[PDB]
Amino acid sequence: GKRGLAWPWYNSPLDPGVLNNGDGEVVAIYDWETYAPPTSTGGTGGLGFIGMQGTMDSDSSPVAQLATRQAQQGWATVFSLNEPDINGITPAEAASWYIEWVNPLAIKKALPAVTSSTTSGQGLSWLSEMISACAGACYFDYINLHWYGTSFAEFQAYIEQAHNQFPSYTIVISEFALTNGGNQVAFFESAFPFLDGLSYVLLYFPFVATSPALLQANDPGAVTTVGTGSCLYTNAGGPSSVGNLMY
Numbered sequence: 001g002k003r004g005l006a007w008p009w010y011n012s013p014l015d016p017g018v019l020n021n022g023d024g025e026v027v028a029i030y031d032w033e034t035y036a037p038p039t040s041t042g043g044t045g046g047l048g049f050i051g052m053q054g055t056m057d058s059d060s061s062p063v064a065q066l067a068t069r070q071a072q073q074g075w076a077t078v079f080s081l082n083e084p085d086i087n088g089i090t091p092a093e094a095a096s097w098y099i100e101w102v103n104p105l106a107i108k109k110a111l112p113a114v115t116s117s118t119t120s121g122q123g124l125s126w127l128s129e130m131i132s133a134c135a136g137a138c139y140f141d142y143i144n145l146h147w148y149g150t151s152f153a154e155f156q157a158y159i160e161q162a163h164n165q166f167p168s169y170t171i172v173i174s175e176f177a178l179t180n181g182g183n184q185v186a187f188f189e190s191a192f193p194f195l196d197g198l199s200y201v202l203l204y205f206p207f208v209a210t211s212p213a214l215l216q217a218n219d220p221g222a223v224t225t226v227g228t229g230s231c232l233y234t235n236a237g238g239p240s241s242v243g244n245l246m247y
């Protein structure tokens with residue numbers, strides 16, 4: 001029971017309960033925000049919502065309301081900043097903000113989702129720098145990885161590399177897929193049993209729990225970089241070839 005729906009803001013036309021068949025492989029949903037998932041039903045299809053303060057403060061996710069939203073919605077887990085390593089946030093800045101605003105939530109917490117960049121001061125390098133800046137004063141349960149690349153072998157080596165750099169830590173993968181042009185179905189088919197087998201991986205969320213039509217209209221940048229082959233829904237709102245693996 002490690003799988004989750006990476007559920008975008010534009011997903012009002014779709015029903016998260018489509019990818020929940022009661023077998024209990026799919027357990028979680030997050031929407032990059034602290035507001036409840038926008039859905040066709042207005043519910044989360046029996047999945048546990050994970051609030052996310054994905055920027056330091058926004059109109060959609062006001063950090064002044066993070067603690068009140070958490071208490072009001074009953075989250076068991078919270079995610080923090082989305083890809084600060086490429087969004088202009090220094091490790092020291094992230095550590096200070098995380099201690100002020102995320103530390104106080106007395107639930108399960110993940111450090112910010114970092115990219116798979118190999119550039120010094122991005123990706124896992126940035127993450128190490130933030131753990132240094134934290135100076136033992138950050139409270140967290142999880143490190144949170146994104147990965148986009150061209151093969152299962154590369155993905156497997158990256159997760160192994162993160163584990164070798166952070167051997168004590170538990171990992172959440174809040175976004176992952178191949179870049180455009182690969183065989184997304186074969187990748188996820190290999191990745192799900194690999195991740196299900198790792199004791200130090202708690203949750204994974206394929207990019208992305210939407211349809212090709214919604215991804216094209218609302219996130220043309222993701223279509224450029226990933227394509228529409230990892231969408232868990234068809235335009236008809238049913239499970240795609242990738243969605244079918246989630247069950």
Ligand SMILES: OC[C@H]1O[C@@H](O[C@@H]2[C@@H](O)[C@H](O[C@@H]3[C@@H](O)[C@H](O)O[C@H](CO)[C@H]3O)O[C@H](CO)[C@H]2O)[C@H](O)[C@@H](O)[C@@H]1O
Binds near residue numbers: 009032033035038061
């Ligand atoms: O109508 C659905 C929902 O819309 C919310 O406002 C949204 C923002 O949440 C959205 O924010 C995007 C992030 O979720 C994503 O990670 O990054 C992108 C790109 O930077 C953001 O745009 O932006 C849209 C587009 O303007 C807004 O309409 C409301 O806050 C919410 O109450 C409402 O249910």
Ligand SMILES: OC[C@H]1O[C@@H](O[C@@H]2[C@@H](O)[C@H](O)O[C@H](CO)[C@H]2O)[C@H](O)[C@@H](O)[C@@H]1O
Binds near residue numbers: 107109
């Ligand atoms: O994220 C690690 C653990 O955080 C816990 O809450 C912390 C409190 O126990 C501690 O006393 O204070 C800090 C600062 O507010 C809290 O973050 C959670 O209760 C645990 O579930 C979590 O594993």
Ligand SMILES: [Cl-]
Binds near residue numbers: 114116124145
């Ligand atoms: Cl990563």
